């Protein structure tokens, strides 16, 4: 919806919508925080897809209101005034809104105003799952959450733990760093490799049957839309890096087999199976905050039949997984994303990039995202839709 120079969109015929989606895709669910981070009666602020939002927990349930008064456009959060359990009053002229439907129900500075009951502040559906807070940044009643989650993330036995932080790069650079088969070269010295005795090649090169290695999913019963890069089953593990024929670097010859398959799913969540251990899975989102930043929402899943196991896992997570994996392994992904910022900052990197064979899967993802996204977020969605 016109976020990029038209001359550039006209050039990338295979995935113009993706290139145009600098602010992300509207009408999809996005994780923005963990349940434990939002307590009863304590409104929290955050920006999602360029929009400032306010989340509050009332009687255990979460509600989301756009953090922008309808009157003069100030953020209510500058000075929070929740005067009754079910409402929030703007600190400026006291326009009061209901958390449940955003309706302007009262105005303390003028209880006779004709605006009362005749204006509505934007609300967004909020759903908690696996201790994660999901917000449907879209219009109309929301589709089921599973549609925008990777397979198995919502399994009843799947115990989810993770971390979240703000990273300075467009969400797409994050996505394409994560779903990249050959980028693991940057993880060759991660402490997880040695310390967890992993079998990790320098890179997973494309095998012989391309159409077999890449699997586009658009037949998922739940409506999931994504792409698989079957590196372990069809790709080739490159363990000896050479230059001029001479071996200059070797991959890791550990015993733990991981990363059998990787998959990217709209609106932008990667699934690595199995990882960081043969009995675990990694699910990570690259949530658009604005055009220059995203939330790097990391989660690790591991089946647990009982609390004793949930606690054991909970301890291994805090003592090993989080420190050694989520950080020790993925930290290099952070500055890697940051490193691509300049090339794509002016939108021209989308034309000048010189791709090679292992990028085949990324190309499949760009097309899938272009064809199946539920809407292009525009700056006008942020300021106020415009039309004559």
């Amino acid at each position: 919806m016109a976020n990029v120079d038209e001359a550039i969109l006209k050039r990338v015929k295979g995935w113009a919508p993706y290139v145009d989606a600098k602010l992300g895709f509207r009408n999809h669910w996005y994780p923005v925080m963990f349940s434990k981070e939002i307590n009863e009666g304590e409104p929290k602020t955050l920006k999602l897809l360029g929009e400032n939002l306010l989340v509050n927990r009332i009687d255990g349930k979460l509600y989301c209101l756009k953090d922008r008064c309808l009157h003069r456009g100030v953020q209510l959060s500058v000075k929070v005034e929740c005067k009754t359990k079910s409402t929030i009053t703007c600190w400026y002229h006291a326009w009061t809104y209901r958390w449940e439907d955003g309706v302007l129900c009262d105005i303390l500075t003028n209880p006779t105003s004709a605006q009362i009951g005749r204006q509505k502040l934007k609300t967004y559906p909020v759903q908690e799952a696996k201790g994660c807070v999901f917000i449907y940044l879209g219009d109309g009643d929301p589709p089921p959450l599973a549609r925008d989650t990777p397979p198995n993330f919502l399994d009843d036995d799947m115990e989810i733990l993770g971390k979240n932080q703000i990273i300075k790069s467009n969400w797409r650079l994050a996505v394409e760093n994560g779903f990249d088969p050959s980028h693991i070269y940057i993880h060759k010295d991660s402490i997880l490799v040695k310390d967890n005795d992993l079998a990790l090649p320098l890179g997973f090169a494309p095998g012989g049957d391309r159409k077999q290695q890449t699997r586009v999913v658009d037949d998922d019963v739940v409506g999931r839309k994504g792409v698989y890069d079957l590196i372990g089953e069809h790709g080739v593990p490159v363990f000896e890096g050479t230059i001029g024929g001479e071996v200059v670097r070797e991959g890791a010859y550990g015993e733990k087999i991981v990363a059998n398959d990787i998959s990217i799913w709209l609106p932008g969540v990667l699934k690595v199976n199995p990882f960081p251990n043969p009995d675990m899975m990694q699910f990570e989102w690259y949530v658009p905050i604005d055009e220059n930043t995203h939330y790097y929402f990391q989660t690790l899943g591991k089946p647990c039949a009982n609390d004793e196991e949930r606690k054991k896992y909970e301890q291994e997570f805090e003592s090993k997984w989080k420190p050694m994996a989520l950080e020790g392994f993925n930290n290099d992904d952070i500055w890697a994303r940051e490193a691509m910022v300049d090339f794509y900052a002016d939108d021209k990197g989308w034309v000048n990039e010189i791709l090679f064979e292992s990028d085949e899967a990324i190309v499949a993802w760009r097309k899938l995202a272009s064809e199946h996204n539920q809407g292009i977020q525009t700056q006008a969605h942020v300021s106020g839709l415009e039309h004559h």
Binding site: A114, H387, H388
Partner: protein, 105 residues
């Protein structure tokens, strides 16, 4: 039940006429060619008087921000307006134009 606005003759096609109703909010009567229509005078997006706006066909444009409404349906035609306008029934009985005291159902 009805109020006397003016004679169809007093209004040229494409003109607006504000109807002040003591004790209640003002209304706006628009002549779109040969048919007369009436809605709330106050723009639903603020406190502007639509009768002071510009009429183009069956669409009225608010003087404050350029928002617009279809004077027949009351539905928003141009941003920033989003809240439909209150439409009132009109009738021309014997050259004179009348407007219902309350907005249609």
């Amino acid at each position: 039940i009805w109020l006397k606005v003016c004679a169809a003759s007093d209004m040229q096609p494409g003109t607006i006429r504000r109807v002040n109703r003591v004790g209640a909010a003002p209304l706006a009567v628009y002549r779109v060619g040969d048919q007369f229509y009436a809605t709330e005078d106050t723009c639903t997006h603020g406190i502007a008087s639509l009768s002071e706006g510009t009429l183009d066909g069956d669409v009225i444009e608010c003087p404050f921000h350029g928002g617009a409404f279809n004077v027949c349906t009351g539905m928003p035609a141009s941003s920033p307006c989003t809240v439909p306008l209150g439409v009132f029934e009109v009738e021309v009985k014997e050259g004179e134009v009348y407007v219902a005291g309350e907005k249609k159902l």
